Amino acid sequence: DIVMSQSPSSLAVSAGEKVTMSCKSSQSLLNSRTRKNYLAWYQQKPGQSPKLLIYWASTRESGVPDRFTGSGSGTDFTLTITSVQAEDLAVYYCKQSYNLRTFGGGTKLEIKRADAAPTVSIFPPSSEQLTSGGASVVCFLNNFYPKDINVKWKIDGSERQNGVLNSWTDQDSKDSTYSMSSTLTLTKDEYERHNSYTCEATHKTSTSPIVKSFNRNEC
């Protein structure tokens, strides 16, 4: 059959530096009749469809920045990005079309940047939710780097770990940061037994956690 394999699985590179990734086929993709390698590269940015970058191994599609260059032949191919930019964050796929078509497993390119502290915001349950018997408290931790972050919820000063939804965005295409949402969900009955609700974020950018709180009596 034709097995396509890519390397690395993932990597991070700083803006302005060079990126090299590789694509192997289990069989030569060089068509002896047309003298071309039937190997294309696609870029898939977060939440988008794949976009064609390179085909016949080295032909750069119209409108693709000159920083993207495909090379190689036979069973081994390379995509090189010189002077990488924040917007190049994406999964890159190679694809053979020598015998039907088969995609490689992708290489995830992340962007390294300077550490950045999160901006933290807390939100109490809406009256339209409380009326239904539930109470979700939301904390946004926005625009930080690197991705690793700790959030604790404290209720009247005591840590709680049950009832929590955490979700990270993909890296931002403009500023190369991450954001995270943390949602604590309680019943209205339990919500009404306590006053102080606190989101505490600990990130490598400070030894001091960022603390956001609200008090039910103040709503």
């Binding site: 085909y55 039907l100 939301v138 979700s167």
Partner: protein, 215 residues
């Protein structure tokens, strides 16, 4: 301008069938092979099959993973491509893309649709609850889109006019329902003096919601 637009994705039970369509314009349809490709959430692209162009008698080929179970066809009068899926299973849950393929010369998929999401599951359709997130130089506001099934939902802010400084958090499945949230950050001088509204849609339940963020 070349346009490819998939439709027909949604929730379907295990063992069921579903047919996707892909409307096209902006190129000579019969000149081109057309492919289908799918992507399970967070996983790699998988080529499924193609239908050849008129020069090659519009014949079909399929990956071993779906041969005998999926069928590709095309309407050459209206320039629509179809994928019939049968005996669906959980492993078929994925975003499905149509892509323009070979023209007898170039080896490339020039163009891809936006994709249509298929979910194979026994769970029922549940519309979201949509809750405003208002605070108790910049101000951050949000919407909580809670307890829906299946994916996806769409969230915009002020009908898409606020796009900068928006973060929409990927949905998370807990106890058989999805929840997501979306934040927007705007100058404090502009809210609440100017209106901020999240617009949420859940196509599975035809839900359309506009939630004004009120101080």
């Amino acid at each position: 301008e070349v346009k490819l637009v998939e439709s027909g994705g949604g929730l379907v039970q295990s063992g069921g069938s579903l047919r996707l369509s892909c409307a096209t314009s902006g190129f000579t349809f019969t000149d081109y092979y057309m492919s289908w490709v799918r992507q399970p959430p967070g996983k790699a692209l998988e080529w499924l099959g193609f239908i050849r162009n008129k020069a090659n008698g519009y014949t079909t080929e399929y990956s071993p993973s779906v041969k005998g179970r999926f069928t590709i066809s095309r309407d050459n009068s209206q320039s629509i491509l179809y994928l019939q899926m049968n005996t669906l299973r959980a492993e078929d849950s994925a975003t499905y893309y149509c892509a323009r393929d070979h023209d007898g010369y170039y080896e490339r998929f020039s163009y891809w649709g936006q994709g249509t999401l298929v979910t194979v599951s026994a769970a029922k359709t549940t519309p979201p609850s949509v809750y405003p997130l208002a605070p108790g130089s910049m101000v951050t506001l949000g919407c909580l889109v809670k307890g829906y099934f299946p994916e996806p939902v769409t969230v915009t802010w002020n009908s898409g006019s606020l796009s900068s400084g928006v973060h929409t958090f990927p949905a998370v499945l807990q106890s058989d329902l999805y929840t997501l949230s979306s934040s927007v950050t705007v100058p404090s001088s502009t809210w609440p003096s100017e209106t901020v509204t999240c617009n949420v849609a859940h196509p599975a339940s035809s839900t359309k919601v506009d939630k004004k963020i009120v101080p």
